[PDB]
């Protein structure tokens, strides 16, 4: 995640300081320079499994269109719960369904 300058509102561009040989966070339309906590500059992944458990909405318990289920709820121990599958459109999506309860809203896998 990349952030901007608080007062200049322009993007912080991390420029090296060879004299101290450290990482910084330097804007360009201003001169506000701040130290970089982690020497990481940019990070990118190849295999993505993020967003499968981050696409959660609270009011999902109020939808009747979704099927109900007697799948025992790990937390609320109810026997009337809905279940669905990840929203990811990747061709290789593995359909280990994200069973969701009326209350817990937890993406639990009982496998």
């Amino acid at each position: 995640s990349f952030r901007f300058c608080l007062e200049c509102n322009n993007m912080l561009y991390p420029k090296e300081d060879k004299e101290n040989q450290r990482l910084l966070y330097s804007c360009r339309n201003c001169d506000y320079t701040e130290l970089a906590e982690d020497p990481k500059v940019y990070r990118h992944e190849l295999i993505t499994n993020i967003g499968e458990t981050a696409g959660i909405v609270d009011d999902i318990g109020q939808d009747p269109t979704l099927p109900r289920s007697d799948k025992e709820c790990p937390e609320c121990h109810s026997r009337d719960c809905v279940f669905f599958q990840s929203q990811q459109r990747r061709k290789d999506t593995n359909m280990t369904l994200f069973y969701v309860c009326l209350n817990c809203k937890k993406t639990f896998r009982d496998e």
């Binding site: 269109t65 979704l66 099927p67 279940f83 669905f84 599958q85 369904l97």
Partner: protein
């Protein structure tokens, strides 16, 4: 039969069902008559053909 509606082929079925009938299996025959869902799946196939 695909999910022409969001996450389901028909509003009369729940979301995320996969039973044979739930995605376009006909169990009846013409003599037995066709329930509306299987009728519609057959109609889709015929239009396609």
């Amino acid at each position: 039969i695909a999910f022409g509606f969001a996450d389901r082929s028909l509003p009369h079925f729940t979301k995320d069902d996969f039973s044979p009938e739930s995605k376009g299996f006909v169990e009846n025959s013409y003599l037995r008559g066709l329930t509306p869902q299987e009728f519609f799946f057959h109609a889709m196939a015929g239009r396609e053909g």
